[PDB]
Amino acid sequence: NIESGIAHIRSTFNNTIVTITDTHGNAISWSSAGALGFRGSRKSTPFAAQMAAETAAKGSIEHGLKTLEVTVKGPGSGREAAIRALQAAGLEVTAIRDVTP
Amino acid sequence: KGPVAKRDVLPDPIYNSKLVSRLINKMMIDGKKGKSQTILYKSFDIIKERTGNDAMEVFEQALKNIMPVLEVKARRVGGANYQVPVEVRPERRTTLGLRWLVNYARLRGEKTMEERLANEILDAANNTGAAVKKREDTHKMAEANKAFA
């Protein structure tokens, strides 16, 4: 049971993972386009991004999260939708970060 | 490059119908327009004696039922083999109307052509026979592969 946390979205060209953690980086929950049953083209899409983002977000709200810091990696098209999806799930987003090298 | 103009046929002198003339020219063999002018005027007297209606009332009704609305056209882009439903241009409707009317009239069992042409018109007018069927046939086929176009 924790309130504040980070959401590490990895949107690649092939897949969207979404982990959510605490401030110490311990995984609270996660979901992904592949674990959403999307396959091939669909895993790349921003539809599958929001699906995974919300699937893990709603998993985090069970543990009782409210505020998320986001961190993004990878060049995929999913970050845009996924981050809105964290706001649309209910969780308020503060600091955005794009940690893409 | 620019659609060639179709040859302007004269009206049929007794029914004043360029449709009826076009039938004559469709029926004409080896440039014997005389034989075909006789046959039709013999066939339309047969229609008027049986029905009592004007031959023009029946013949136009016959064409309505033979005349196609949609046709199958072969399209083979890459694979495709698509039987593209194509709307029959109003000139090609009459074309296929008169072609089928004559083509199936010649194939009928009756002894003389004047009777054969009369009976095919009478059958066409009653929404039956073979020439009406042929329109249905291609529409049934056009409905079958209607998912292309």
Partner: protein, 708 residues
């Protein structure tokens, strides 16, 4: 899966079902389980694979059958193909091909069907039927063909001509412009038939370009004989009987502040600073409802017109020029029958006291916005000496306007500042100059007063709970806003709101942050593309852009019919005291039709004003050929690039003129991406361009990439 897939299909098959997103589905159907949420998705995969539910591009789900008959408005292209705008605009553009449009015209309502193929990114529509005919009439040049006639439509959006028979020639020769009352329409291969209505005049005439647009849009025109009779009978001076029951305000310092070319002076203004630090604001509005009485000839015409329209070269007024510029006008130094709103406003901008009453004022002076700025901002002594009695009032006006603005921004109002422009033409209609319409302090002063007046009137009648007309602005479209909120996340911003329920303040908080940055024009432009339009309505639904729940238009009855209605409702409810049930039921019946009509007439007017602006904008630049300009990339469509010159003139730059490389539109990051040379053309970038093709007739201007 099978169970839910059927249960979902059964729910979607209900007649009341509308398109629902993944989240919205499991709300009416109701799902709360984490493992049932894991069950939903592979089910959506299956139903969409089997062709049982189709995904609308807005990520809403509906059976192929539900969408099948989209019944959108025809968005036809000038070349001869088309796209579509479905009933719910959430659905994307469905492609209607030249071959299968089947007698559909740009703007008609249809029932296009889907194709089981697509040779591109777009869904393939097909006009299997026309649910409704639109384009009732077209304007155009008449042309003689093969011993026949054929009016060619003004716009190229109709790709065919209109068959003119000789009985509908009626003047139209090779040259003459004419409207066509289409007496028949296309038929497979055949064209539309018609007649000749108004012989506008030879097509190549100066002032036909306007007159052609005057009839194209279906704008108003010349006052009917009964309206002109009533206008002629209206007194040029106030009768002593009309001064009865009106508060005398003539001996007070009351003035008008308008543009230099304004003859239709609606509003008067006085401000007195009180000893407690509050201000007393006297807003006085021309009493048009006195002259233009209910069910009069001018009233029926004013309803028909709906608003004044301000074309580049002329004004088409809502009420006759004799009234609008004469007795109704608050001309300087005369008695004026005016409905007033007198407001005491505290240091936080809150209206503590207010009174609405009938009155008569003596316009001490007619001021310009330019003069008032020079007094207040430039501190100009010469204009101060000239208007010495007004100078103390202008200082109190400046402070109150600041207080009202500070309230309005703190309430959360969204203040964009897209540079509007005023095309300057002579009396012959030649475009001598074009310049930016600078809203400085004096304009922003009058704006705030009219706003608080309008809010106060609207608030009063909300609490009176009587039938009344409001000026509403809905919350922005949740799909367009969703794309905007994504777009502003490219830059690292976070907006404290959802696409369903965003607070106006949140959208202002972006506009403030981006001020003076490379993400300023881009964001602002995508925020507009997510904004809607404002309209009149009998229900108090609130004004999103002004962030207030109570708004109406009271302060311009010469030029807006809803303001003349408010004036009559004020006279009905407050002055005459008629708040009986029969009076309410009568107005409750009449207001919805007036509101919907007047809102349609406003949109028609604005479209026409813009059309003439864009027209004379080309006319101005029919000599700019070659001349290079440093103008910013205002828009990046896939078919080219759009560059606004500083003076608000935009022009096109296709890949045809992107000669160096084969560029590509990145939608997510609103930009042009070239690859062969490795180039980048984002929006808002300051660049150079050259005028190549100002085609005035279609209102085109073209540029070429001189550079960045």
């Amino acid at each position: 899966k099978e169970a839910f897939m059927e249960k979902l299909l059964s729910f979607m098959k209900e007649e009341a079902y509308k398109p629902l997103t993944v989240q919205e589905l499991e709300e009416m159907l109701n799902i709360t389980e984490a493992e049932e949420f894991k069950e939903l998705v592979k089910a959506l995969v299956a139903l969409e694979e089997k062709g049982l539910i189709v995904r609308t591009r807005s990520d809403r789900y509906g059976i192929p059958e539900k969408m099948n008959l989209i019944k959108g408005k025809i968005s036809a292209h000038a070349k001869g193909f088309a796209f579509l705008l479905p009933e719910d605009t959430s659905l994307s553009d469905v492609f209607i091909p030249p071959n299968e449009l089947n007698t559909a015209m740009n703007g008609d309502i249809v029932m296009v069907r889907l194709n089981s193929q697509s040779s591109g990114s777009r869904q393939e529509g097909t006009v299997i039927r026309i649910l409704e005919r639109a384009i009732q009439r077209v304007v155009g040049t008449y042309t003689e063909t093969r011993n026949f006639g054929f009016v060619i439509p003004d716009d190229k959006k109709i790709t065919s001509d209109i068959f003119i028979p000789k009985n509908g020639k009626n003047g139209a020769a090779e040259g003459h412009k004419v409207v066509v009352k289409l007496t028949s329409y296309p038929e497979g291969r055949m064209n539309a038939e018609g007649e000749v209505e108004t012989i506008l005049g030879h097509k190549n005439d100066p002032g036909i370009d306007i007159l052609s647009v005057i009839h194209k849009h279906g704008l108003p025109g010349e006052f009917p004989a009964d309206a002109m009779e009533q206008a002629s009978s209206t007194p040029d001076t106030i009768d002593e009987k009309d001064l009865k029951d009106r508060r005398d305000l003539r001996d007070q310092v009351i003035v008008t502040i308008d543009g230099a070319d304004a003859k239709d002076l609606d509003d008067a203004v006085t401000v007195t600073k009180l000893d407690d630090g509050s201000y007393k604001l006297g807003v006085h509005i021309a009493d048009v409802s006195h002259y233009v009485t209910e069910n009069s000839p001018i009233d029926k015409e004013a309803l028909e017109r709906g608003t004044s329209v301000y074309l580049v070269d002329r004004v088409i007024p809502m009420i006759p020029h004799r009234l609008s510029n004469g007795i109704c006008s608050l001309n300087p130094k005369v008695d004026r029958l005016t409905l007033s709103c007198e407001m005491t406003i505290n240091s936080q901008g809150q209206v503590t006291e207010h009174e609405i009453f009938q009155s008569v004022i003596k316009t001490t002076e007619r001021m310009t916005y330019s003069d008032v700025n020079k007094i207040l901002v430039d501190d100009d002594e010469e204009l101060k000496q000239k208007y010495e009695p007004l100078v103390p009032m202008f200082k109190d006006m400046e402070r109150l306007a600041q207080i009202l603005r500070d309230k309005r921004m703190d309430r959360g109002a969204v203040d964009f500042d897209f540079k509007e422009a005023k095309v300057l033409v002579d009396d012959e209609g030649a475009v001598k100059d074009v310049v930016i319409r600078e809203r400085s302090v004096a304009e922003k002063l009058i704006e705030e007063f009219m706003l608080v007046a309008n809010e106060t009137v609207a608030e009063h009648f909300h609490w009176m709970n009587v039938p009344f007309i409001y000026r509403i602005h809905e919350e922005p479209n949740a799909e367009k806003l969703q794309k905007f909120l994504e777009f502003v996340t490219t830059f690292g911003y976070v907006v404290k709101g959802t696409a369903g329920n965003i607070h106006p303040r949140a959208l202002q908080s972006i506009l403030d942050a981006v001020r003076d940055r490379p993400e300023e024009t881009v964001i602002s432009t995508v925020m507009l593309r997510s904004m809607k339009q404002a309209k009149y309505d009998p229900q108090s639904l609130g004004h999103f852009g002004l962030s207030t729940e109570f708004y109406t238009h009271f302060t311009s009855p010469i030029r807006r019919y809803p303001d003349l209605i408010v004036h009559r409702l004020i006279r009905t409810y407050l002055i005459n005291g008629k708040v009986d049930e029969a009076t309410q039921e009568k107005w409750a019946e009449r207001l919805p039709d007036i509101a919907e009509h007047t809102s349609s007439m406003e949109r028609r007017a604005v479209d026409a004003e813009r059309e003439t602006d864009d027209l004379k904008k080309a006319e101005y630049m029919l000599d700019k050929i070659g001349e290079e300009f440093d103008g910013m990339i205002s828009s990046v469509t896939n078919f080219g690039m759009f560059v606004e010159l500083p003076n608000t003139i935009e022009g096109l730059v296709h890949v045809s003129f992107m000669t160096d490389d084969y560029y590509r539109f990145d939608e997510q990051h609103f930009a042009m991406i070239g690859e062969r040379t490795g180039n980048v053309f984002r929006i808002g970038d300051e660049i150079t361009v050259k005028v190549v093709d100002v085609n005035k007739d279609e209102r085109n201007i073209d540029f070429e990439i001189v550079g960045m």
